Swiss-Prot record, chain A:
Coiled coil: none annotated. Component of the small ribosomal subunit. The ribosome is a large ribonucleoprotein complex responsible for the synthesis of proteins in the cell. Part of the small subunit (SSU) processome, first precursor of the small eukaryotic ribosomal subunit. During the assembly of the SSU processome in the nucleolus, many ribosome biogenesis factors, an RNA chaperone and ribosomal proteins associate with the nascent pre-rRNA and work in concert to generate RNA folding, modifications, rearrangements and cleavage as well as targeted degradation of pre-ribosomal RNA by the RNA exosome. GO terms for cellular component: cytosolic ribosome; cytosolic small ribosomal subunit; nucleolus. It comes from the Eukaryota. Residues 42-104 form the S4 RNA-binding domain. There is a cross-link at K230 (Glycyl lysine isopeptide (Lys-Gly) (interchain with G-Cter in SUMO2)). It comes from Oryctolagus cuniculus (Rabbit). Belongs to the eukaryotic ribosomal protein eS4 family. CDD domains: KOW_RPS4, S4. Keywords: Acetylation, Cytoplasm, Isopeptide bond, Nucleus, Ribonucleoprotein, Ribosomal protein, RNA-binding, rRNA-binding, Ubl conjugation. This is Small ribosomal subunit protein eS4. It is found in: Cytoplasm; Nucleus, Nucleolus.
UniProtKB/Swiss-Prot annotation, chain B:
This is Small ribosomal subunit protein eS6. Coiled coil: none annotated. Component of the 40S small ribosomal subunit. Plays an important role in controlling cell growth and proliferation through the selective translation of particular classes of mRNA. Part of the small subunit (SSU) processome, first precursor of the small eukaryotic ribosomal subunit. The chain holds residues 179 to 237 of 249 of the full protein. Ribosomal protein S6 is the major substrate of protein kinases in eukaryote ribosomes. The phosphorylation is stimulated by growth factors, tumor promoting agents, and mitogens. It is dephosphorylated at growth arrest. Phosphorylated at Ser-57 and Ser-58 by RPS6KA1 and RPS6KA3; phosphorylation at these sites facilitates the assembly of the pre-initiation complex.
Curated annotation (Swiss-Prot), chain C:
Signal peptide: none annotated. GO terms for molecular function: structural constituent of ribosome. This is Small ribosomal subunit protein eS8. It is found in: Cytoplasm; Membrane; Nucleus, Nucleolus. The lineage of its organism: Eukaryota, Metazoa, Chordata, Craniata, Vertebrata. It comes from the Eukaryota. Residues 7-25 have a biased composition (Basic residues). Keywords: Acetylation, Cytoplasm, Isopeptide bond, Lipoprotein, Membrane, Myristate, Nucleus, Phosphoprotein, Ribonucleoprotein, Ribosomal protein, Ubl conjugation. The keyword Lipoprotein applies. Belongs to the eukaryotic ribosomal protein eS8 family. The keyword Cell inner membrane does not apply. The modification N6-acetyllysine is found at K36, K127. GO terms for biological process: translation.
Curated annotation (Swiss-Prot), chain D:
The modification Phosphoserine is found at S67, S110. This is Small ribosomal subunit protein uS17. The gene is RPS11. The lineage of its organism: Eukaryota, Metazoa, Chordata, Craniata, Vertebrata. Component of the small ribosomal subunit. Part of the small subunit (SSU) processome, composed of more than 70 proteins and the RNA chaperone small nucleolar RNA (snoRNA) U3. Its main location: cytoplasm.
RNA sequence: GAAACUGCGAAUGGCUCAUUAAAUCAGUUAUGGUUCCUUUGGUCGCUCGCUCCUCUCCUACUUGGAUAACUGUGGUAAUUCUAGAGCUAAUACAUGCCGACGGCGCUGACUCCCUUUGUGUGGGAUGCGUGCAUUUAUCAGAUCAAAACCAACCCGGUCAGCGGCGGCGGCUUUGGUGACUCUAGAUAACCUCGGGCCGAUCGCAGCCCUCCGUGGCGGCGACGACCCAUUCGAACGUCUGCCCUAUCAACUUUCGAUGGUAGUCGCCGUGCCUACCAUGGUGACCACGGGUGACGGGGAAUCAGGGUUCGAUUCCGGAGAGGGAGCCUGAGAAACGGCUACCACAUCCAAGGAAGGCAGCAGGCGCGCAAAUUACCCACUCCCGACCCGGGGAGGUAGUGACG
RNA sequence: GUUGGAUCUUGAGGGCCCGCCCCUCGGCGCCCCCUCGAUGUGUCCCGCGGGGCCCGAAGCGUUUACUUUGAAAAAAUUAGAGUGUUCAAAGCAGGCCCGAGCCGCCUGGAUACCGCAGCUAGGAAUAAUGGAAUAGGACCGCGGUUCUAUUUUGUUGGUUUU
């Protein structure tokens, strides 16, 4: 048996890149149902008390949430295990600090403060662009936000500045060659780079040849490429650890050099 | 029982409904302008394409 | 209970499969509607995954469409003359999809004569006498000329249709499941298909 | 091709139906109503046989409502026996690392053969494509019957 | 604010590996074959006026009537047993309203003008169809290169028409997928009845009245409802892989074995089931049959390398909860801390009856070569709920502990 | 069942290395369009940006296995990096500066592994595989005959071609 879906998830069976411990706790937070899939999510708790360390109990975490000092995507949340994802902005209204989640090329979720100007909008790639019922068109973004009456020239894999004050499309950026991308998941996790060429194969799975800033060339599936804006025109800054790609030797040299040299 | 709270709630229900109807109208109208203006630059391409097909066929 | 799985029965090799788990609610495979001809009852049923499925017990009206005029009228279905799934279904008068039924001629004919303002011919003596003549005369005083220009090659319709009007019932084919949909709706038989079904009706009898 | 009045029920294709209009008699088609054909993509073209057809098969992906998605496999026809099905033997390599040679293995698979393929025989190389289960054994459908060298009757003088 | 009704959890959790040999399961693929509460994002006035019953269908300043808890009387040897009387709520239950003063097609009483009429331009009260969903039917879903003439008739340069048209030209209008009769549009209806939907709900507070209590409106959040996407999934489908056995060599359907066709049925594909019709399907490349302390994987132990051996057992998937069979609730269960029957077991009995399932945590009996507290706690870690607040043998904590 | 003979072509630059020999793109070119310089619905340098056709190049000729590069490829385990658990089994930590207003600074939790099969891509040796024999394949080589689809002569119908 198995008479229905689990409402629990054990630790030491949760995805590595959330940066939880091994067996020292027997249960992981587990994301709630929401706009993103649970593998790629980062439960609010892990950000709040394991990275920003504002709680040393679970009792505190609930009490923090009930204050409602936390908006996520401009809207007022109170969920203890909110399923935030890629380019989801967290807005602390008590301190005026806006943090966004973007991958390190190490593969660890970055604590990446952004200005409240850049926390007005986020760039969301279209997943489907849908001729809906009664001939009204809609675009649907990756984060499951359906915006009606969208711009009437858009096509698949375009990005779309969604605004979080007022909802809706606030222009768009057209998908073209050489656009900035962050390649997410896989062995190419958290790398940034242009395009170069998108190879098309009829039937399932189309691969996109990416060249990164360093000049290392690799392919991944189209699914694993996320378009984050226009070529050589960032809209949010690079995170820690380069965010490009760095070798284990170089990384060791940074780790030893910076440590016992601060303070 | 109808009481002042109940009346106020009844006015909130209709108000929201009224707000929602007018919202749909505005979005549709604004969208129509965008779609219509685009025509003049975008869709007029078609004349050029039909015409050139005859130049090409000549030789 | 009543069952529906792939983890039973014989293999390709001539082997025999041995069970995967014990019967579960999903496998349920409810007994037949067994809807026939008689006064309409339909029941709403709760089915798996939520949603509502209609179980018809007795039907006697359907919505039958005249596919060459693009109009559908609600008519009586009085009997099953032919069914190609099983002969027994006809005899028992059980309504299933693809039953060849008998519907009234009169509403389709009445619609056509009124609408096109000219009669197809004469169906019957009884039919003619109070109206049909009325239609022919027209209620247009004035706009008589408009009807004549508008309707060319009318005062008639196709040969197969006219022949069925004479009978006083039209053959029609059920295009929906009467037990799951709860609708015994269908399209009127026409051209080649009608000819073939009459051949089957004649072949089987005698 | 083969008539659909051979059985005991007349059939139609979706949204192909008789309008007989005002004019007397038919349709009453002269090919049993317009034969609709459509492509299936993935480097296959609908042949003459689909267009010529009027058959009661609907497990054909050029006249049916079946969709071909997934793996495309090839096999050799080991048996043709009864109508509308063939058996293909699919040779594959099973890799053994433990011994430093490895062994061929095969399976026989019953596969539907549409009447959109005729003038076919045993020994023919055939290209099948994945589909939803059509019948209990048959998951697949013949998309193209290839002829192909190594088979000959290609040295000719007629 | 005890209680009780309402809504949700109770399918999860925990436990154990008996069962099963391409079955389970792993990896790789699919759903264009289908269902999905919730969350997150859109979708929230209308009958487009029955050519306004919806200005009369005038209950909108809001309709109808019953159960608990409660109160009282009680029955039963024994029951988480339960009767009857007297009340009486709703975000429970069944209804139904205020509203387009500027909806929409042909039939059409017809009426106006120019070639009488004929023929053509026009616009029209009287009717009926004008939200979506369901079900049916048809159309639609434009999509590729040039000429000379003739028949119909748009304009422009002329006039052999006389731009009423004959002689020369001319602008020439649809969303996706590799791929669907896909999406979307047009027409004609259909009904679901107690038995599609479109709010008769509440809590916080802030308004204004050609003016005084009414009717209108702005913010915050609660819950319900409809539709689509989403998330957690589910059920089936691809490919490739498993132990020993020939003192198991032919096997599969008369109670379908394989296939065609059509239907019943199912959340949905499918011999799933059934009619009719074919005679298939599979094997020496080990099928078929038999055996199995045979759950599967990630993983574990030893080996120069090659290999050999292990995997119930801290995590993931599947499976079962004494054995069988059936079922209810719910989006999800064929559920033993749900139910119902039988069968094997056990219990109470006043003999009429009645209630039950430690392969949950401790503990006991039996078994054995073999394995611990009838303890303490929700503070941690997380889960559930109407919720920070509560509950947790999940889980933490100690005790037992020369596995190591 | 296993195993199997022989036999087919690819000179420069710098002190090996590189491309070659016995049409969806890019583009030598030819023709088209906004045109790029002779020019400013538009040429004669050109397809350069979108085209068509079509060479060095390239699907080229007929298939592969193999091998090679990518992706997809649970965490724990495990190898193993960073880390001073007093050593260590292990754990994923930590280390500094400031009197305690420095209302503080900062490094991490690498990387590696995937029975197979499948997916992508480079190679063409090896092992199989490819064809023209009473002729066949190439290049609009061309004709007489017949058909059907749609562009176009405004639109729509008929006839006749292309």
């Amino acid at each position: 048996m198995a008479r229905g879906p689990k409402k629990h998830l054990k630790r030491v069976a949760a995805p590595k890149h959330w940066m939880l411990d091994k067996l020292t706790s027997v249960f992981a937070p587990r994301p709630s149902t929401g706009p993103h899939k649970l593998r790629e999510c980062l439960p609010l708790i892990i950000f709040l008390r394991n990275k920003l360390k504002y709680a040393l109990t679970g009792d505190e975490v609930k009490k923090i949430c009930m204050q409602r000092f936390i908006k996520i995507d401009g809207k007022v949340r109170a969920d203890i295990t909110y399923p935030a994802g890629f380019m989801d902005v967290i807005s602390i209204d008590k301190t005026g600090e806006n943090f966004r989640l973007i991958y390190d090329t190490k593969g660890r979720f970055a604590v990446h403060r952004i200005t409240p100007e850049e926390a007005k909008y986020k760039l969301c790639k279209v997943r489907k662009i849908f001729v809906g019922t009664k001939g009204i068109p809609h675009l649907v973004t990756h984060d499951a936000r359906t915006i009606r009456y969208p711009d009437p020239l858009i096509k698949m894999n375009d990005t779309i500045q969604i605004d979080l004050e007022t909802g809706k499309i606030t222009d768009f950026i057209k998908f073209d060659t050489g656009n900035l991308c962050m390649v997410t998941g896989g062995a190419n996790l958290g790398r940034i780079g242009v395009i170069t060429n998108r190879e098309r194969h009829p039937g399932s799975f189309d691969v996109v040849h990416v060249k990164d800033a360093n000049g290392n060339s690799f392919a991944t599936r189209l699914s694993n490429i996320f378009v984050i804006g226009k070529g050589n025109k960032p809209w949010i800054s690079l995170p820690r650890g380069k965010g490009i790609r760095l070798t284990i030797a170089e990384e060791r040299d940074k780790r030893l050099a910076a440590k016992q040299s601060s303070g | 029982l109808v009481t002042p709270r109940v009346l106020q709630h009844k006015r909130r229900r209709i108000a929201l409904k009224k707000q929602r109807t007018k919202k749909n109208k505005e979005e549709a109208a604004e969208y129509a302008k965008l779609l219509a203006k685009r025509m003049k630059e975008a869709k007029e391409k078609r004349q050029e394409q039909i015409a050139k097909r005859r130049r090409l066929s000549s030789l | 209970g009543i069952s529906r799985d792939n983890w039973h029965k014989r293999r390709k090799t001539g082997g025999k499969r041995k069970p995967y788990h014990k019967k579960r609610k999903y496998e349920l495979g409810r007994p037949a509607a067994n809807t026939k001809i008689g006064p309409r009852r339909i029941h709403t049923v709760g089915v798996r995954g939520g949603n509502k499925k209609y179980r018809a017990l007795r039907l006697d009206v359907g919505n039958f469409s005249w596919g060459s005029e693009c109009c559908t009228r609600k008519t009586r279905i009085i009997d099953v003359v032919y069914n190609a799934s099983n002969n027994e279904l006809v005899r028992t008068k059980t309504l299933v999809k693809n039953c060849i039924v008998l519907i009234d001629s009169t509403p389709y004919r009445q619609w056509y004569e009124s609408h096109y303002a000219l009669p197809l011919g004469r169906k019957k003596g009884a039919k003619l006498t109070p109206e049909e003549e009325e239609i022919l005369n027209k209620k247009r005083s004035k706009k008589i000329q408009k009807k004549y220009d508008e309707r060319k090659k009318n005062a008639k319709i196709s040969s197969l249709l006219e022949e069925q009007f004479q009978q006083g019932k039209l053959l029609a084919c059920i295009a929906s499941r009467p037990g799951q949909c709860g609708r015994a709706d269908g399209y009127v038989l026409e051209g080649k298909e009608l000819e073939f079904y009459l051949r089957k009706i004649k072949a089987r009898k005698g | 091709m083969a008539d659909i009045q051979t059985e005991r029920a007349y059939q139609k294709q979706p949204t192909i139906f008789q309008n007989k209009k005002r004019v007397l008699l038919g349709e009453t088609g002269k090919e049993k109503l317009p034969r609709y054909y459509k492509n299936i993509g993935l480097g296959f073209k609908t042949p003459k046989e689909a267009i010529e057809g009027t058959y009661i098969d609907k497990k054909c992906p050029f006249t049916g409502n079946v969709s071909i998605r997934g793996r495309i496999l090839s096999g050799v026809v080991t048996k043709m026996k009864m109508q509308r099905t063939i058996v293909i033997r699919r040779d594959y390599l099973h890799y053994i690392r433990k011994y430093n040679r490895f062994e061929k293995r095969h399976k026989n698979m019953s596969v539907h053969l549409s009447p959109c393929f005729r003038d076919v025989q045993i020994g023919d190389i055939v290209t099948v494509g994945e589909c939803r289960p059509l019948s209990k054994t048959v998951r697949f459908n013949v998309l193209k019957v290839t002829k192909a060298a190594g088979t000959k009757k290609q040295f000719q003088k007629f």
